[PDB]
Amino acid sequence: LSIVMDPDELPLPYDASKWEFPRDRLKLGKPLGRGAFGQVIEADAFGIDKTATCRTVAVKMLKEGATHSEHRALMSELKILIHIGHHLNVVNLLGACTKPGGPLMVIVEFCKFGNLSTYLRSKRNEFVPYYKDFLTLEHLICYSFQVAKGMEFLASRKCIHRDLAARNILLSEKNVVKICDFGLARDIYKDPDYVRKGDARLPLKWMAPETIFDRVYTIQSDVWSFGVLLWEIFSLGASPYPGVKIDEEFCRRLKEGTRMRAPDYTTPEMYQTMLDCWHGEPSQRPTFSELVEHLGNLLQANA
Numbered sequence: 001l002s003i004v005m006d007p008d009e010l011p012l013p014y015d016a017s018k019w020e021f022p023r024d025r026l027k028l029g030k031p032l033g034r035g036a037f038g039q040v041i042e043a044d045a046f047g048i049d050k051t052a053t054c055r056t057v058a059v060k061m062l063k064e065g066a067t068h069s070e071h072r073a074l075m076s077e078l079k080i081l082i083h084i085g086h087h088l089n090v091v092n093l094l095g096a097c098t099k100p101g102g103p104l105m106v107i108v109e110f111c112k113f114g115n116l117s118t119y120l121r122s123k124r125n126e127f128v129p130y131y132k133d134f135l136t137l138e139h140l141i142c143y144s145f146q147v148a149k150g151m152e153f154l155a156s157r158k159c160i161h162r163d164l165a166a167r168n169i170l171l172s173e174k175n176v177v178k179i180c181d182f183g184l185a186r187d188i189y190k191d192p193d194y195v196r197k198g199d200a201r202l203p204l205k206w207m208a209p210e211t212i213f214d215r216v217y218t219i220q221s222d223v224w225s226f227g228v229l230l231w232e233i234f235s236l237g238a239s240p241y242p243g244v245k246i247d248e249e250f251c252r253r254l255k256e257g258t259r260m261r262a263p264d265y266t267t268p269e270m271y272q273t274m275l276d277c278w279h280g281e282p283s284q285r286p287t288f289s290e291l292v293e294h295l296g297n298l299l300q301a302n303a
């Protein structure tokens, strides 16, 4: 799984009174995403936060063929979920069924519109830079800004997202977007955004260079990812580096300071933003804390 704590800053038990939730107050439904051993299922959960009100949630759980190895992975996600705590632009934990005699289940915010990529890619027809339902440039700046913030909070809690992409970002009601980690519920052996490298399969289009050549994950080799994330947005859900075969070659030109062109809906400011994020030197490219403001700036400038 992908959202983990920053190793740049290592080196507390589970609070059941605050988190544990009755498997008999939880009603399972359709799968939203299946991966290999994991799956996110849509659920209805009674009085999980408002006494006596039902509530549509998303429950993370194992599926068939998982081993205790997975189960421990899922015990981990809950743990860091509890760590990071509530922010609005990230997915939040609602509660957990960690009782014996039952499947481990982590319950998290449901997002009615799913991941951003597939959402924008569907909105290509209904867009305009400046009529209800339609996407505008105001929205696009806004989403970007929300993720920066989300990424910032995600930093403040000493975490890193080792797979930051528009496909791991969800849209819910009222134009809120939340950073998430599909974790086990994403199969990388079946998603082409993930390239085989040995038996490791990596989101290479998103991965910053230092991460690729060496394997240095940092809040900053994330900004790069976020630069790429910005592209996906102002292309309305287009996959990065079109046509370009991702190979020993690709990686080369990348550190020759070679970047993608501009996406179809980008503004000039946005594109240059994307270009900072894609600095060779991981230090030169801004902090998410700094992107939060520029985008805040840009969002005011778009009326």
Ligand SMILES: CCN(CC)CCNC(=O)c1c(C)[nH]c(/C=C2\C(=O)Nc3ccc(F)cc32)c1C
Binding pocket: 032, 033, 040, 058, 091, 108, 109, 110, 111, 112, 113, 114, 115, 170, 180, 181, 182, 183, 185
């Ligand atoms: C044609 C479009 N479809 C209509 C039937 C839309 C389908 N909807 C979907 O695919 C979908 C929806 C509505 N939610 C999710 C995922 C998550 C969610 O909600 N909270 C999370 C929290 C954490 C996490 F790691 C994933 C999720 C999907 C994949």
